[PDB]
Amino acid sequence: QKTVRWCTISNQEANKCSSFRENMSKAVKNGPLVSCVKKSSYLDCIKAIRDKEADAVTLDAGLVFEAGLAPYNLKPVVAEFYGQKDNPQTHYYAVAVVKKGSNFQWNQLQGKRSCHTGLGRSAGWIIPMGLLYDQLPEPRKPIEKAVASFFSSSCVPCADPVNFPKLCQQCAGKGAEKCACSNHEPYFGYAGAFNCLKEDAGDVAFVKHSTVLENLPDKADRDQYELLCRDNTRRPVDDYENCYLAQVPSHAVVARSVDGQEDSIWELLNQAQEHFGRDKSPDFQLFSSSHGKDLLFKDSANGFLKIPSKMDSSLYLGYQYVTALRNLREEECKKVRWCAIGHEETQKCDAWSINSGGKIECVSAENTEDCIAKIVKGEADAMSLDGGYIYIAGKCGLVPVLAENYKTEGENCVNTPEKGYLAVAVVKKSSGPDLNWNNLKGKKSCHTAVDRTAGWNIPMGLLYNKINSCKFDQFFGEGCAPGSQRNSSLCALCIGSERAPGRECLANNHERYYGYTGAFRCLVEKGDVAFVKDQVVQQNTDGKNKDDWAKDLKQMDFELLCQNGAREPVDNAENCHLARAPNHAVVARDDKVTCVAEELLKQQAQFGRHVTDCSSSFCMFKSNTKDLLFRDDTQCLARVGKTTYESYLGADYITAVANLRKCSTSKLLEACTFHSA
Template sequence: VQRYTYVPTLGNLSFAVPTTTIKWCVISELELRKCNDLAVRSPAFTCVGKMDHDACITAIKAGEADAVTLADEYIYKAGLRNYDLVPIIAEDYRRNAEACSYSVAVAKKGTGFGLKDLKGKKSCHTGLGTSEGWIFPIGTLLSKGWMSWGGADNQPLLQAVSDFFSASCVPGASGYQTLCQLCKGDCSASSANEYFGGAGAFKCLAEGAGQVAFMNPADIPASERNNYELLCGDTTRMPVENFKTCNLGEQLAHAVVTRRDDTLSELIWTSLTTVRAKICCLVTRQSKQPRDSTTTSIRWCAVGPTNGPETAKCDLWSGNSFQPESGTPAIECQTGSTVEECFKKIMRQEADAIAVDGGQVYTAGKCGLVPAMVEQYDEGKCSTPGTAASSYTAVAVIKKGSGVTWGNLKGKRSCHTGIGRTAGWNIPMGHIHKKTNNCDFTQFFSSGCAPGADPTSPFCRNCKGSGRTVGDEAKCKPSADELYYGYAGAFRCLAEGAGDVAFIKHTIVGENTNGNGPDWARGLRSEEFELICPGKDGSVPINDYESCNLATVPAHAVMTRLAIKGRVVDVLKDQQARFGRHGSSDNFRLFESVDGKNLLFKDSTKCLQDVQTDSYESFLGQEYMTAMKSLRQCSDNTPDLEKSCTFQSCQ
């Protein structure tokens, strides 16, 4: 489809100039990044940056831009005679259309006040004149009689609102000092104001600038919803999930707006459909973001403290990944205290990728992330594109001669790789739940170490921590700082007598015995350990894992956002060519850990291979998905982040 723009020439003559490029208007760094991701997927799109939506509307009228996504109050303005723009595509919010169409009042849990108690409080708004941040909340306060205003003849509405709240951030309300007092940057309705838009209003509340935020519930980050409540019109409070019954009003969906041009409209629709773009990805939900990553770099998330072993390895990787052509490293490092914190950073676009196990793939998938590459543990399959994804076997290991069997596990002490991990938790606890139908696993095992469990739980009692004698905050934390975390950590827990059984991967015993592994494993012999499994009495040798195991499970995968999956794959392919098993660099090895085990990637990784699907369900497979859904019947085994992400929203 071609668009024809008529350009004036000599006299009254004009010529049709064909073009197939759609100039999308964006108003922030975040929107620009998303637009650039869209343009990478389709050459039909280019990006035009403007300061605010008013400027975009003017640019589209003038032909300097072609399209923008607007909220309802701007759609109305764009349709006025002096602009004469039209909405052509409404956003589809998939499973729950209403999730993106309500205005709510949000406050931190435990703050105590209700909607009628807001006089004298500090408020955060998405913007002056916006439905969710201004029209509905101010209209509600006025209609309930909780805010006084004698009408426009008496005083401007802005002055009445200024008198009601002690301080506010109302982007676009320049000229009213109180209404701009809390804003960060300036008071404009643009990215120059960090508290502009839905994400900005939430940030205003989260950072403690305001006590209440008026916003769209879809802009409350999934990972944060348990920390906040909604203020209802009947003066009660409700959880964020109750936005349908506790809200200030319902607004129209956002829509793509352009000029009155059937050919242009058809081009926009066809191009967006072709790339299956999520239109809401270009809606303003601003937050202050780190600087743009270049198209040849990605931000990797390391788990643990900023001075921990994963961060140290990532920093070494980053230093060796310098690109002379761009003058920047291909890898930049971010740090999350846990895997879940890294997921949150990737969701917030503060990081781009992390490699995790199947159980964590499940959680990440529930939160909208997708698998990009998978670890391959078979060297022979690295040179064969399109081979089946690598897998490994989950096993239960005991000390030889201990007398522990699967039949007498009840009451024993257990060693787990971590809460929510595949071989260390999901698979064995799935077997136990199937046997007992009891979700309280503390009634099955007497104690143990399952990093990530509640610190007061018996599953933290036997954890080792970092080894410090005092002030050890690492105990039971799901990071490499906890010495019993991960595959090697769970085996160490068993070897050092802190547990009677270890749930790990089938290769771990061999990797940490017979002279292999770190200092703590010296002197251990593989024949000192055996396997137990459901349906078999007694125990079997370690190398009989094919006949005695808990399940065969998917390999670890690199998780990222769908919009940047291509970039992540390209960068990682380049990096493993330089630093993989057959790379040319002697300064750094991607799949080796010097100061720990399985840092960033599993040490047994031979290469990374493309994942051919964007679906985490397809990647994990039906058998694993069935096991996970069964285990999720036990709500205590569902990570808080995963619970939050099942809240219906358009994000």
């Protein structure tokens, strides 16, 4: 019924696509149909997809980046994987292949002849040229001109043969097909570049790690070839793991960002790998063809993986690679951009910005995950996170910069490491003794949010060990666990916002039961147990909180549930808690750690706890509502040195969280753990 229109770039690809079509028709009765649209290069395909004349094409990651730019706006939806299906690799190695006895090293490439897969491609172009950049003769813009003056001549398929003739000089295509961006140029692609070297049109080929073994005959003339290593030595072709230029992400199928039919694309490809995958059929091979190498998909792929929905091109490629790509394409610690979540945090941020004289700038997002993603992508620089989210951010590659401290007051606060706060379970003293730790089934729970330390990871981790199931919403009766599935019973007690409707169960300040205070309010108004930090009761009772719901509460009206079944007063969490919680911390990308840390230590020297008059001046650690930007009981931000999320959080906490990985519903976590190695 549904049709996926695949874009081909050559007569050879068109031949394979016709057989893909015919074979899928026969093998799959109801699965999407395939039809083929024949263009003459990947760039014509990207445009055909944008204009809705086609739906899909497979691209080297370097070109995924170009497809993801305006005005094309395509996104990667399915990735090739290499290697064994039980340990799929979503990267491959770029290498430089030379013939034995040619006697030159990496540092002597000047004046040689080069064979490239194609302009703008990972192994063929982006990686080798990024490495050689500093040796190219200036001016290096555009890069083509500099490359044409560095190598004596080359074959770079897809280069403009009119403006850069030397880049197309060693290519082998006839007439108008010379230097073509397709299999009509014999030296196009991995196979082509290798043939370029083989036939002595070039002295070096920039290809991938499987290229030589894939393209050499029945037996091994393989001893005739070697690899150029970056330490200026040469190694055998099967020793690429010790002689590669870089590791690069998989070729991926791309599609329209809006109305891209990706559902259809995955359904097609998934069924196709089942019937016509590696060694699956004599009638048709997805990853092979008698008409050529790497047609439609690479011959070294062994299947497909669906790309998570939150992985856009930036996330798929990774920030380092996007920066190298950006570097070759366009031809400081002045400020810290904070990521604020929602309106109240944005207003506190704005105030900070003004008071700081612009050293702090403010970027907004509607939830924690969107903030973390902005930081990873370079749209923001820092925010403070609960341990549960540090874990997620750490998987996405962010690093802890400074810790919030809660126990140490005064001048030594910044230099004192704290062990952590405590995750506890708080109940009303008035609840009968049947309410205890071993009898929570069917009870009404209040949680700070899904994926936070005290609110979720610690308690739900403990419970998972008992019930051996991720269906928490079938264990508890009804609760408020912000961030849960909207029609779950774990959203049923949530009350959203007083001003705007439809905000129930959101994991942000629109939800009145969100956060430490929030969950304590949930306990007071509706729940039986709150999963929260120690001290939340003391901080919101006996008059410290003046809001209607809290003004008459007393500390003595609450108790803690201990794991042995007993109950203790709230002043005794040290002997009645669920586990230690790592202190919340400011995270940043590895390139900004120093900058973020140094400026914040200066911010707090001006705006920290010692400010006796908050109003005339700004107070970083006090908040109009609750835990705006930092926890309200934060005494200072403290140095953590050079550490990683794993050592910051501790093996005990890492163990607990990883224990729950099967139950995770975080879309960010799913995107940040997609890639191998």
